[PDB]
Amino acid sequence: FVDSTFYLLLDLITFFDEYHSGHIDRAFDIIERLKLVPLNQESVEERVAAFRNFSDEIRHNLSEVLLATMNILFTQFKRLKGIEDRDSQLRSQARTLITFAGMIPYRTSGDTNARLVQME
Amino acid sequence: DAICSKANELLQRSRQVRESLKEYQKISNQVDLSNVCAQYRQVRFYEGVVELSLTAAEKKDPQGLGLHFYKHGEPEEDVGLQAFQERLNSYKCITDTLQELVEAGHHFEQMLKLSQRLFSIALYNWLIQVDLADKLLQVASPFLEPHLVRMAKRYMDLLWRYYEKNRSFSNAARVLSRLADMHTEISLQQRLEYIARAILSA
Numbered sequence: 371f372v373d374s375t376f377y378l379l380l381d382l383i384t385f386f387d388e389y390h391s392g393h394i395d396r397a398f399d400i401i402e403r404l405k406l407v408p409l410n411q412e413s414v415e416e417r418v419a420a421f422r423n424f425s426d427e428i429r430h431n432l433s434e435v436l437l438a439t440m441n442i443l444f445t446q447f448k449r450l451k452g453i454e455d456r457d458s459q460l461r462s463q464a465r466t467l468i469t470f471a472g473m474i475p476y477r478t479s480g481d482t483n484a485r486l487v488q489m490e
Numbered sequence: 491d492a493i494c495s496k497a498n499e500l501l502q503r504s505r506q507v508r509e510s511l512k513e514y515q516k517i518s519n520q521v522d523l524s525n526v527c528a529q530y531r532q533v534r535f536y537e538g539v540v541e542l543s544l545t546a547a548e549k550k551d552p553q554g555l556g557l558h559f560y561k562h563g564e565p566e567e568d569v570g571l572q573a574f575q576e577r578l579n580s581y582k583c584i585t586d587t588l589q590e591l592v593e594a595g596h597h598f599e600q601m602l603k604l605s606q607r608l609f610s611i612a613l614y615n616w617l618i619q620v621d622l623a624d625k626l627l628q629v630a631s632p633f634l635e636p637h638l639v640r641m642a643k644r645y646m647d648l649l650w651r652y653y654e655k656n657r658s659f660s661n662a663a664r665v666l667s668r669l670a671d672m673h674t675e676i677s678l679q680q681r682l683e684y685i686a687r688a689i690l691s692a
Contacts, residue, residue, distance in 0.1 A: 412686060472690040 375427050378404065382431060389438055394446040398460070401439055406432065407467060414469040421474060433479050436471050440464055440487050464488065494522050501529045511535060518546050524583060531590065536597045540584055544604055547580040556608055574608075581609060585616045607633050614641075623647055627655055646674060653687070663691035 385400045401407060406428070408414040421429070443464050447457060468484065475482050497517035504510030514530065515538070523546065530539045551573050558569035565571070584601065591597045601613065610633040617626055626634070638652050642665075649669055656662040666688035670681040 412683075415686075469686075469690050 371425075375425055378428060379431075382435070385438070389442065394442040397438065397442045398446070398463070401435060404435070407435055407439060408470055409463050409466065412466060412469065414466045414473065417470050418473050421477075429477075432474075433481065436467055437481075437484050437487065439467050440484050443467075444487055444490070493517070498522070498526060501526050505529050505532060511538060515542060518542050519549070520546075521579075527583065527587065531587070534593075536587065536591055537600050539587060540597065540601050541604070543580050543584045543587070544601075544606060544609060547577045547609070548606070550576060560608070577608060578612070581612045584609075585613070602629060602631050607636075610634070611637050618644075618648075623651060627651055646676070659691040663688040666691075 381400065381404055385397055385404075388400070389397045402409045406417075408417045421432075424432075443460055447460050468488065471478075471482055471484050494517075497514065500510060500513045500517060504514065511530070514526070518526075523543075527539055527543070530542070555569045556574040556577055559571055559574045562568040588597065588601065602610070604610075610631055614626060614629075614634070614637050617623060626638075638648060638655060641648050642652060646669070649665055653662040653665040653669070656665065666684040669676070670684040670688070676684075
C-alpha cells in the first residue's frame with residue numbers, strides 16, 4: 371500500500387514535469403493512466419464512490435489533477451484553423467471531469483474555478 | 491405612386507454609383523421595397539438595409555398593435571391582424587436578406603442589437619427552423635430569455651438549449667427536473683441523464 375501511493379505520487383510528478391514545457395498531449399495520456407479521473411463515460415460517479423476510499427495523501431492531490439486536465443484539454447482543443455478531427459473526445463473528457471468536480475466540491479479546497487478555464 | 495417611382499430612381503442612380511443611400515432611407519416603405527432591396531444589396535448595403543426593413547416595420551405599426559394581436563392570437567380582427575400579417579412579410583424580408591449574407595457579423599449584430607421583442611421572437615423562430623438553434627445559445631439579447639421561457643413547454647431541443655443556456659446551476663437544474671417529469675416521450679435513460687445532470691447541479 372505504502373509503495374503504491376509512492377508510485378502514484380511519482381506519476382503525478384512526472385505529469386507535472388511535462389505539464390507546461392509544452393507536451394499537452396502527453397499530459398492527458400499520463401493523467402488517464404493514473405486511473406484516478408473519469409475519462410470514459412459518466413462513470414464520474416464511480417469516481418465518487420472511489421474517492422472517499424482514497425488514501426489521505428491522494429485525496430488531497432486531486433484538486434490539481436482536475437484543472438490540469440481542464441487546461442491541456444483547453445489548450446490542446448484550441449479551436450483549430452481550417453480530414454478527421456475528433457474534437458468530440460477531449461471534450462467529453464472535460465464533461466465527465468466537470469461532473470466529477472461538481473460532485474466533490476465540498477470535499478475539495480473550494481476552487482471550482484475550473485469553470486474559468488472550462489469556458490472561453 | 492409617383493413618389494415611389496422617384497424612390498426607385500433615387501436608388502437607381504445609386505445603382506450606377508453615401509448620399510443616395512440616405513435618400514433611400516428617407517423614402518423606404520412597402521412591397522416595392524422588396525425590389526428596391528435587391529438594389530441596395532448590390533453595393534453591399536446589407537447592414538443598413540436591415541435597420542431599414544425594421545424601421546419600416548415599426549413605422550407602419552406604431553406601435554405595438556401587433557403584439558396585442560398575438561396575445562389574443564385570434565383569427566378575428568382582434569388588435570387588428572392586418573398589422574401582424576404586414577410585419578411578417580417585412581420580417582421574412584429581413585430573414586431572407588440574412589440568408590443571402592451567407593463581413594457576416596456586422597449584419598447580424600445589427601438585427602440582434604435592435605429593440606423589437608416580435609422581430610426577435612420571429613428571428614428565433616426562424617433560427618429554429620434552420621436548426622440554427624445552437625447559435626441561439628450564443629445570442630445575448632435580453633429578448634432571448636423570455637423567448638426561451640415562453641417556448642419552453644421539438645421543444646425539447648429548446649429545453650436542452652435552456653438548461654444549457656442557464657449558466658446558473660439552480661435554474662438549470664429546475665429545468666431538467668421538469669424535463670424528466672414531462673408528460674413528450676423521452677427514454678428513462680435520458681430521463682435519468684437529466685436527473686444525473688440536474689443532481690450534479692446540486
